Amino acid sequence: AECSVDIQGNDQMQFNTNAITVDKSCKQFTINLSHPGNLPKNVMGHNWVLSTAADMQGVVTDGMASGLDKDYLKPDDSRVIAHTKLIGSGEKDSKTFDVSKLKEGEQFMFFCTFPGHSALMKGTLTLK
Ligand SMILES: [Cu+2]
Incomplete structure (x- = not known):
């Protein structure tokens, strides 16, 4: 069935979605991230990083202390269950991962780890 989603991260520090559904019949799932903004990676970089809800905060914090x-x-x-590269203005990156890494019931979170961005740049991902 459908096993892919397109996501944009823009100059306004936002993802154009805050909830992703992975159909449990999918074996693999693809995220196609793009940056339709004009600002550089060092001030407006975005990645799409997937973890369990419980792990998000540690990933964000430790990621922050790692530099650009x-x-x-x-x-x-x-x-980190899956992730794209960090991208700036005009770039794109796609990431495909195994659905065997997800489970029903659990709440996963996707987010950007560029410093601060995750206060706005985050959403849930659910297998169902
Ligand atoms: Cu970002």
Whole structure:
């Protein structure tokens, strides 16, 4: 059935969705991120990072303390279930991951880890 979603992160620090549905018949799921804004990665970079709700805060915080040089993700962070590269104005990045990494019932969160962005740039992802 459908196993993909397009998402945009813009100059206004927002994702154009705050809730993603993964159909449990999907084996793989694709996120196609784009940056339709005009500002550079060092001041308006966006990634789409997926973790459990419970892990989000640690991923965000440890990612913040890693610099831009590391795409604002802590090296070797196993809490990261899937993620795109960090992108700036005009860039795109797509990420496909295994649905076997999700479970029904649980609330996953997707978010951007650029410093601060996650106060606005976050949403839920649910398998059903
Ligand atoms: Cu961002």
